[PDB]
Amino acid sequence: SDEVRKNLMDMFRDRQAFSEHTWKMLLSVCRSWAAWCKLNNRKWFPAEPEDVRDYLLYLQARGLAVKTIQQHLGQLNMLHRRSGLPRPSDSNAVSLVMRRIRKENVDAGERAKQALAFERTDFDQVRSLMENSDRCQDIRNLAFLGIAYNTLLRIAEIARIRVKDISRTDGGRMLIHIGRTATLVSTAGVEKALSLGVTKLVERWISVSGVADDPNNYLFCRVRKNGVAAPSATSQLSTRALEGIFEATHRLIYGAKDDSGQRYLAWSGHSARVGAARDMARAGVSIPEIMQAGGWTNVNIVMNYIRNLDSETGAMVRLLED
Amino acid sequence: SDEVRKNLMDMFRDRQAFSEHTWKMLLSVCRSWAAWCKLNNRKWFPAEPEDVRDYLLYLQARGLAVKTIQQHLGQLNMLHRRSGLPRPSDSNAVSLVMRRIRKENVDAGERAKQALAFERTDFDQVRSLMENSDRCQDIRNLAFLGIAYNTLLRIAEIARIRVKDISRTDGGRMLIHIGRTATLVSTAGVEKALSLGVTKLVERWISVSGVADDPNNYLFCRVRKNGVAAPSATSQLSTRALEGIFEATHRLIYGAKDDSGQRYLAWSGHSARVGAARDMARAGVSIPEIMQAGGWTNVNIVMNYIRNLDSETGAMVRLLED
Amino acid sequence: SDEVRKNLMDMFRDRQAFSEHTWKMLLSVCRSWAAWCKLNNRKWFPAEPEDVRDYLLYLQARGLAVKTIQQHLGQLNMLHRRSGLPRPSDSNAVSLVMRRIRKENVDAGERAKQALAFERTDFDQVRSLMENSDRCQDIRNLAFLGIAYNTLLRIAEIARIRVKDISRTDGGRMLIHIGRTATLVSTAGVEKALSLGVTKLVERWISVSGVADDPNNYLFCRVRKNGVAAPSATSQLSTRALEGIFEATHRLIYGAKDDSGQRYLAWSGHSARVGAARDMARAGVSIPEIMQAGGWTNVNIVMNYIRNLDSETGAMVRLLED
Amino acid sequence: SDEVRKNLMDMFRDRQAFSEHTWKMLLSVCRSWAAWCKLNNRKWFPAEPEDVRDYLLYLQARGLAVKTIQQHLGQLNMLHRRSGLPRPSDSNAVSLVMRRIRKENVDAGERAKQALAFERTDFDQVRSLMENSDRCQDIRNLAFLGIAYNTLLRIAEIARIRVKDISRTDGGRMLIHIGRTATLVSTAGVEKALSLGVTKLVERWISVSGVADDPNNYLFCRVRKNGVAAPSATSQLSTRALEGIFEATHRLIYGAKDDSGQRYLAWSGHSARVGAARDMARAGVSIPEIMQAGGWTNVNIVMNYIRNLDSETGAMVRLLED
DNA sequence: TATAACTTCGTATAGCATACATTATACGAACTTAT
DNA sequence: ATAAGTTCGTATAATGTATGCTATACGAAGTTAT
DNA sequence: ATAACTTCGTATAGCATACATTATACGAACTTAT
DNA sequence: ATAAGTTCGTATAATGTATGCTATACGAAGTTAT
């Protein structure tokens, strides 16, 4: 019992070893799990298998997604494992009910959604519409969309880019150094190249904003209503704002969102990553190069990205209509 | 011993954690194992390494395929792991006997078999031989063969297709929404578009069957001896019947099978999937796109289907022939 | 003591789990180790770390290669580990001296040797020298050399080819099914494709030898002095004779070997393997394709194979001179 | 307790099991670790998880690179494992700080440096300034740079070349046999060929310095203030002097260093390796052949050198530019 | 004076890499139910 | 009598799932320099 | 006899995976024959 | 007095290594249908 309190202490002490998001979801799950326990006269820690099973079935009855429920169990599992205690998933009660929840839901029709693709055709169209704008916000959003499509970097990674991370090739193309991704933490890091055209877009943003006045300034910053950019070495442009750019750009071309309330009705943070991967698959780009561009080590993720390739223009329809 | 019983009751309580096909096979392997144990005066549960190795040598001598033998061991492993007992596979004896069996059967010449290919030329041939038939049966069978080849859906997936799952694209093609995906993250996508030709085959079947009288009706249904269709919203046409279609079509063209007992002498449920993969390969469709079309994540299942094609011969052939 | 005998008896009971060559070397090393123990008054089993150290230094003093010394230790390690005993390498005395011997020898000049390359130029020269021969032995040899270069198969793998393992692509090119290699054992196997040219060479051998009179016959067999082939479904052509073919072909072009006693003064069983890998590397074939050609799953052996690329016509000299 | 003392004496007896560079670093880390322990009132051996953690945080606060911190950790791991004691790394506390330290340092902008490239353009320039310099110092220095660039041998390897390692090729080029290879399986080969141009440079040095008066003499040696070389078969030019040649050459063209304390402000011992890799990449030489040229088996080292070249920009730039 | 263009936040959900186990078809035979 | 299925048990081919994270998705409420 | 092997025993290379050393950088303090 | 080294300690970049097999290398000695 002293081991448990000490094991948890060490995790909290070195809390920076984990992602801020991992912590944020840990607490979120704990609130949900603790509130349910209080209301059902159960002990929230350490978690008893039978209780966790009743709780996961409650989550299913609430109509939550399979990947949502897995997250709640996962966080429960981490809290226990890193305490030095057995996990709920170490028992049949919990591991079987999770298999059961996943099976029942998939059979009921559940499938994991995917972001609406932001592909080359969308990029060229947005560019032709926005490229002649002298508006500071338009010069920024166009430079952002360029980088997102060119590099397949997560919006959180783009937000972290600082001026000092930018270098050039012998041919004058921009190179962006990334030291940290979701799956890689290195001092060697990775280099993302930008095409001549995308480079030009970023160059225009740099001169109009004044970001290069301090090498520590983040490349992307907020632009206030009077069209003046406010560069900062301490404050990143939020992922929410970056998601907003994707959405505003979708609104610019296609109008308001459908009323369904579903996710992925407009472009979002993940859109350019999937769009670029699809364009690569379609152009016949070899797998090694696809993964080099996406920064992926395993080939299974390519199938994740291209799963929703348009079947009406798919290989089978085209072959049969011979 | 109370623990083992507790574990089995948990396994019973959450039956739905595993597919019914999994349960049917567990039972089957248990019957074979317990009958062999009974005969040879061995305890069947918990299973002992020495007895499992003698059983596996029996499976070999009997002439079962390596994959069949792995399946019996795998079913025994699961039962023991879920019971809380040591897995047969984790002992030295069983581990050594599997390596021996694998190596012996391979050197004896045992070959992994696969569905006889149902390709474009077969599909063309069948359409050409059967298009003049106005029989309900023949119209249905043609629509089934058309769907199977066009979509690469497996027989169970085709059997689950309901009328409400069907819509129309701006091009006038039929689109089949997948109501129950294979997995949570559906590598095959959420939709399957039909060609204009295959649309016409399904349309014809829809009008002669009357399945569109209720959108909850399954697309395919049984047709009795008087050419009268019996549409249903509750009862699917068995996957056995769908294999029957494939087999009966092969019988029409090539005649009756050998009384040998070999597998894959006529077409079967996976024939159109094998066939379509080969045709895309001939058409120069890239591996990732072929894989998305069938919903494959494992490239080696695909490679097995296309490995005897001239375009797959490798770099040494190209170097030598230039 | 009883545990150890049981563990050893079980390994021997399932001999077939290991290669014949693993057993041959286990027995070779044991004789050597046990003879040295007898003359030096040491107990041979279980081996004491100090005694094993002395033996390794003894092998060093004899001037044996590092990989020879490693094989001796390796077999000693296997015998102990599979007995359920700690390995000699589990102690500092043995593992440190092995590192030391390796390091001392490499500092003294030692490097692992590689087979002399049998490249495309070499193959074409032999082909245009021996094409015309109607001698049954020469037809066989040329077919062998073609397969060896085209497939990059080990000689033992080629010796194992049975007539039934041969099939055709629609274009008429030969396919060889191989179910077992040094790193792969599977009923699915792999298919090695031959060029139209190499296919013609094999066809000629099949026509001349009469091997196709029984599908179970090995493709390659001995040819006696009257130029008549002796097909067999039970007796292989020895890997020794296969090496002889490489040795005789080399002698035909460069005359009798030097009497220095050094290895790889002429072509041998591994030569077409390294030569083909170098031709692919020089022809700018992609890593994945090189690996597919040689049936390798990890990228590091590519570097092993091409380590001895001719420096004089290598990239740097060509870069500096033009 | 005495088992640990026996293990350490095994370590001393077979000290040649590790490089003397490994030894020098181990002592260095031990001194740092023991000095910190003595200052902070902690027992230095065995090392406790909590104490190791605090020491790592100290190294971080000191401003040491992540690799430097790993190096220190690795040494402590080695010392303990060989002692038969549990490793610091295998603890919760140490695993957690390493993740934390790596993430913090990367985010704080820490970058792994690499040698400033010495490329063909630099080599031609130096050659056009020192070609006719008749001074003995310059003839040697230019011969060294030539070999360094042509062979991609490391400084230590270049210092070990002796006269008897040199021979003539059929085409009039100097062929340098590698007397002592990097590893048992030498990825770089056993032979380095010099171009006709670099051959002239090396010949000039041989004739003007008198090293070929004894075949056992090292190729390179001291050249004192009076322009007289002092050939030696027992002592080599220090790798330190060879770095000085690179540094002095850089000062020749660009003057005194930026003096910002930073590394790689002038050329160093790895500069010609980096530079040759980049030049091969420009010329379109295959990755595998670039890797063979410098003995590389880890592609990621090569990539770090060439990833900021236009030819290595990736598929997305390629797709976006046409 | 409100207001663009954010930022912060909560719950809900997807993407990664690695390790390794179910899950679906195949098919002859035995039933079954409307002709 | 029988067409055309369904149900079933076992043989074997075909992919499947968990883990331990780390990330985006988006409506809602709050903030600051205009 | 003899071609053309086979058999055999010892010596040594190739493979896939999982993890640990081994080299260079460089300012400073010496050393040595001009 | 000094050019041009060498030695040294520590920072950091660069690859390196063991493991548990499975394979070939090749001289020699023995074999069998001509």
Q: Retrieve residue B69's tokens.
A: 């033998």
Query: CA B266 to CA B114: how far, in whole Å?
Result: 11
Q: Retrieve residue B45's tokens.
A: 């549960």
CA distances from D160 to B203, D256, D310 (A): 82, 30, 36
Strands (E), chain A: 166-168, 174-180, 185-193
Query: CA B250 to CA B233: how far, in whole Å?
Result: 30
Q: In what order do the strands lie in the sheet with C166-168?
A: C166-168, C174-181, C184-193
CA distances from D48 to D28, D52, D77, D78, D89 (A): 19, 6, 12, 15, 10
DSSP string, D46-96: SPPHHHHHHHHHHHHHHT--HHHHHHHHHHHHHHHHHHT---GGGSHHHHH
How many angstroms separate the CA of B170 from the C1' of E32?
45
- Residue C159, Cβ neighbours under 10 Å: how many? 20
The reply to whether CATH 1.10.150.130 applies to domain B1-111 is: yes
The DSSP symbol for B175 reads E
- Residue A93, Cβ neighbours under 10 Å: how many? 23
Query: CA C212 to CA C203: how far, in whole Å?
Result: 10
How many angstroms separate the CA of B248 from the C1' of G2?
64
CA distances from A95 to A29, A90, A92, A101, C232 (A): 18, 7, 5, 10, 56
Q: Retrieve residue D228's tokens.
A: 């007289």
- Residue D317: closest CA among A289, A275, A195: A195
Residue A229's SS3 state is: strand
How many angstroms separate the CA of D302 from the C1' of E20?
34
**Contact predicate D246/D265, CB 8 Å:** no
Q: Which nucleotide is nearest to C70 (CA to C1')?
A: G12
Residue nearest the C1' of G2 (CA based): C225
Q: Retrieve residue B317's tokens.
A: 């052939």
Query: CA A85 to CA A6: how far, in whole Å?
Result: 12
Helices (H), chain C: 2-13, 20-40, 49-61, 66-81, 92-107, 120-130, 136-151, 155-159, 196-209, 239-254, 271-282, 287-294, 300-306, 315-321
For B123, the closest chain A residue by CA position comes to A320
Strand (E) or helix (H) holding C186 = strand C184-193
Q: At what angle do helices A66-81 and A20-40 cross, to 10 degrees?
A: 90
Residues 6+ apart with CB under 8 A from D159: D218, D220, D236, D237, D238, D239, D242
CA distances from B39 to B46, B57, B60, B150 (A): 17, 15, 17, 50
Residues of C in contact with D279 (CB under 8 A): 319
Is the peptide bond between A231 and the residue preceding it cis, with omega within 30 degrees of 0?
A: no
The DSSP symbol for A192 reads E
- Greatest Cα-to-Cα distance within chain C, rounded to the nearest angstrom: 72
Residues 6+ apart with CB under 8 A from A129: A252, A253
Query: CA C231 to CA C223: how far, in whole Å?
Result: 9
Distance from C87 to chain D by nearest Cα, in Å?
Answer: 15
Cβ contacts below 8 Å, chain B against chain C, sum to 108
- Residue C240, Cβ neighbours under 10 Å: how many? 10
Query: CA D310 to CA D292: how far, in whole Å?
Result: 22
- Residue D65, Cβ neighbours under 10 Å: how many? 16
- Residue A149: closest CA among A114, A116, A180, A120: A120
Own/partner long-range contacts of D13-18 (Cβ < 8 Å, ≥24 apart):
D13/C96, D14/C92, D14/C93, D14/C96, D14/C97, D14/C99, D14/C100, D16/C100, D16/C103, D16/C104, D17/C96, D17/C97, D17/C99, D17/C100, D17/C103, D18/C99, D18/C103
- Residue D140: closest CA among D255, D234, D248, D251: D248
Place of tokens 């792969």: C184
The DSSP symbol for A221 reads -
**Contact predicate A155/A314, CB 8 Å:** no
Q: Retrieve residue D197's tokens.
A: 């141009």
For C285, the closest chain B residue by CA position comes to B315
Q: Retrieve residue A184's tokens.
A: 């890689």
Q: Retrieve residue C236's tokens.
A: 């292989």
CA angle in degrees (0–180, nearest 5) for C227-C231-C235 = 120
Query: CA D153 to CA D147: how far, in whole Å?
Result: 8
Within 71-90 of B, beta carbons closer than 8 Å to A belong to 82
Q: CATH second-level architecture of B113-317? A: Orthogonal Bundle (1.10)
- Residue A148: closest CA among A291, A270, A19: A270
Strand partners, C218: C162
Domain C113-320 sits in CATH at: 1.10.443.10
Which active-site residues of A does the annotation give?
A: 154, 270, 273, 296, 305
Place of tokens 């083992």: B4
**Contact predicate B264/B114, CB 8 Å:** yes
DSSP string, B96-107: HHHHHHHHHHHH
Are B97 and C185 inside 8 Å of each other by CB?
Answer: no
Task: Give the CA count within 13 Å in the CB-facing half-sphere of C181.
Answer: 18
The DSSP symbol for D236 reads P
- Residue B308: closest CA among C164, C288, C168: C168
Residues 6+ apart with CB under 8 A from C308: C114, C117, C274, D189, D190
A113 Cβ under 8 Å from any chain B Cβ: no
Residue B293's SS3 state is: helix
Q: Provide the resolution (angstroms).
A: 2.6
Are C99 and D171 inside 8 Å of each other by CB?
Answer: no
Task: Give the CA count within 13 Å in the CB-facing half-sphere of A91.
Answer: 20
Residues 6+ apart with CB under 8 A from C258: C265
CA B124 to chain centre: 23
**Contact predicate D49/D86, CB 8 Å:** no
Rounded to the nearest 5°, which phi and psi values hold at B10?
Answer: -65, -40
Query: CA A76 to CA A44: how far, in whole Å?
Result: 10
CA distances from C138 to C145, C155, C193, C227 (A): 10, 18, 22, 10
Q: In what order do the strands lie in the sheet with D174-177?
A: D166-168, D174-177, D191-193
Helices (H), chain D: 3-13, 20-40, 49-62, 66-83, 92-107, 120-130, 136-151, 155-160, 196-209, 239-254, 271-283, 287-293, 299-306, 315-320
Distance from C301 to chain D by nearest Cα, in Å?
Answer: 9
Residue B306's SS3 state is: helix
**Contact predicate A192/A151, CB 8 Å:** yes
Distance from C19 to chain B by nearest Cα, in Å?
Answer: 10
CA angle in degrees (0–180, nearest 5) for A90-A95-A97 = 145
Place of tokens 């296969």: C242
For B282, the closest chain C residue by CA position comes to C170
- Residue A15: closest CA among D97, C107, D318, B42: D97
**Contact predicate A219/A164, CB 8 Å:** no
- Residue D249: closest CA among D232, D231, D234, D269: D269
Query: CA A82 to CA A11: how far, in whole Å?
Result: 8
Strands C166-168 and C174-181, by their bridges, are antiparallel
**Contact predicate B201/B142, CB 8 Å:** yes
- Residue B123, Cβ neighbours under 10 Å: how many? 23
Query: CA A205 to CA A194: how far, in whole Å?
Result: 14
Residues of B in contact with C198 (CB under 8 A): 320
CA angle in degrees (0–180, nearest 5) for D290-D291-D296 = 150
Residue C178's SS3 state is: strand
Place of tokens 């030097």: C258
The DSSP symbol for A228 reads -
The structure's method of determination equals X-ray
**Contact predicate C141/C147, CB 8 Å:** no
**Contact predicate C68/C113, CB 8 Å:** no
B196 Cβ under 8 Å from any chain C Cβ: no
How many angstroms separate the CA of D228 from the C1' of G33?
11
CA C136 to chain centre: 26
Query: CA C98 to CA C93: how far, in whole Å?
Result: 9
Task: Give the CA count within 13 Å in the CB-facing half-sphere of B36.
Answer: 19
Nucleotides of chain F within 7 Å of a protein C-beta? 2-28, 33-34
Distance in Å from the first CA to the final CA of chain B: 70
Strand (E) or helix (H) holding B250 = helix B239-254
B299 Cβ under 8 Å from any chain C Cβ: no
Q: Closest partner residue to C312 among D173, D279, D286, by Cβ?
A: D173
Secondary-structure class of domain A113-319 per CATH = mainly alpha
Whether any strand G atom is under 7 angstroms from the Cβ of C160: the reply reads no
- Residue A152: closest CA among A286, A306, A273: A273
The DSSP symbol for C175 reads E
- Residue B282, Cβ neighbours under 10 Å: how many? 16
Query: CA C232 to CA A114: how far, in whole Å?
Result: 60
Whether any strand F atom is under 7 angstroms from the Cβ of B75: the reply reads no
Query: CA C82 to CA B278: how far, in whole Å?
Result: 46
Query: CA C82 to CA C4: how far, in whole Å?
Result: 9
- Residue D190: closest CA among D151, D237, D239: D151
Residue A166's SS3 state is: strand
Strand partners, D168: D174
- Residue C135, Cβ neighbours under 10 Å: how many? 13
Give start-end residues of each CATH 1.10.443.10 domain in chain A. 113-319
A179 Cβ under 8 Å from any chain D Cβ: yes
Q: Closest partner residue to A169 among D92, D99, D310, by Cβ?
A: D310
Residues of C in contact with D296 (CB under 8 A): 303
Residue D229's SS3 state is: strand
Query: CA B176 to CA A41: how far, in whole Å?
Result: 48
Polymer length in residues for chain A? 322
Query: CA C125 to CA B98: how far, in whole Å?
Result: 46
Strand (E) or helix (H) holding C189 = strand C184-193
CA distances from D171 to C313, C319, D174, D205, D206 (A): 11, 16, 9, 21, 20
- Residue D85: closest CA among D11, D143, D136, D157: D11
Position C255, amino acid = G
How many angstroms separate the CA of D71 from the C1' of H11?
10
The DSSP symbol for B236 reads P
Give start-end residues of each CATH 1.10.150.130 domain in chain B. 1-111
Residue D170's SS3 state is: coil
Query: CA B274 to CA B116: how far, in whole Å?
Result: 8
Residue D166's SS3 state is: strand
Residue C265's SS3 state is: coil
How many angstroms separate the CA of D274 from the C1' of H28?
52
Q: Retrieve residue A102's tokens.
A: 């996943």
**Contact predicate D227/D123, CB 8 Å:** no
Q: Retrieve residue D123's tokens.
A: 């080599």
Strand (E) or helix (H) holding C114 = none
- Residue A76: closest CA among A34, A20, A110: A34
**Contact predicate B36/B57, CB 8 Å:** no
Residues 6+ apart with CB under 8 A from A262: A113
DSSP string, B203-231: HHHHHHH-GGGSTTSBS---B-TTS-B--
Q: Which nucleotide is nearest to C64 (CA to C1')?
A: G11
Query: CA D294 to CA C315: how far, in whole Å?
Result: 11
Whether any strand G atom is under 7 angstroms from the Cβ of C225: the reply reads yes
Query: CA C54 to CA D292: how far, in whole Å?
Result: 38
CA distances from A127 to A132, A143, A204, A270, C296 (A): 9, 10, 13, 19, 46
**Contact predicate B265/B258, CB 8 Å:** yes
Among the listed residues C154, C160, C250, C278, the single catalytic one is C154
Query: CA B318 to CA D54: how far, in whole Å?
Result: 60
The DSSP symbol for A167 reads E
Strand partners, A176: A166, A192
- Residue B266, Cβ neighbours under 10 Å: how many? 20
Are B309 and C169 inside 8 Å of each other by CB?
Answer: yes
Q: Retrieve residue A119's tokens.
A: 């592909």
Strands D229-230 and A166-168, by their bridges, are unpaired
Query: CA A207 to CA A163: how far, in whole Å?
Result: 12
Query: CA A314 to CA B290: how far, in whole Å?
Result: 10
D44 is catalytic: no
Cβ contacts below 8 Å, chain A against chain C, sum to 6
Give start-end residues of each CATH 1.10.443.10 domain in chain B. 113-317
Query: CA A120 to CA D17: how far, in whole Å?
Result: 57
Q: Retrieve residue D140's tokens.
A: 């040697």
CA C308 to chain centre: 18
